[PDB]
Symmetry: C4
Subunit: 25 residues, 4 copies
């Protein structure tokens, strides 16, 4: 495993991408 | 701990998310 | 190498940048 | 040091923030 801030941030940068893309569509 | 660029960047990707979301609302 | 979530996220933050920039233009 | 993809990505997430903020203003 890695540290929970690093991992958490990673997931965020995925979720925030979907939201942004969804908004555009 | 980790390195301050890595950690700092992590926090940014959270703050930038809130700002973006807040703007949408 | 590093872990595939970390690396994958890195690439995303690049692709998402291009898309955003392209949209602005 | 860390790996150049990780570091590079970190900087990007800062630059992309400024650009986004500047655009809003
Ligand atoms: N946006 C990023 C969040 C976190 C730190 C850095 C590298 C990875 C993980 C993607 C920038």
């Amino acid at each position: 495993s890695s540290d929970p801030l690093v991992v958490a941030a990673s997931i965020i940068g995925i979720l925030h991408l979907i939201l942004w893309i969804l908004d555009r569509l």
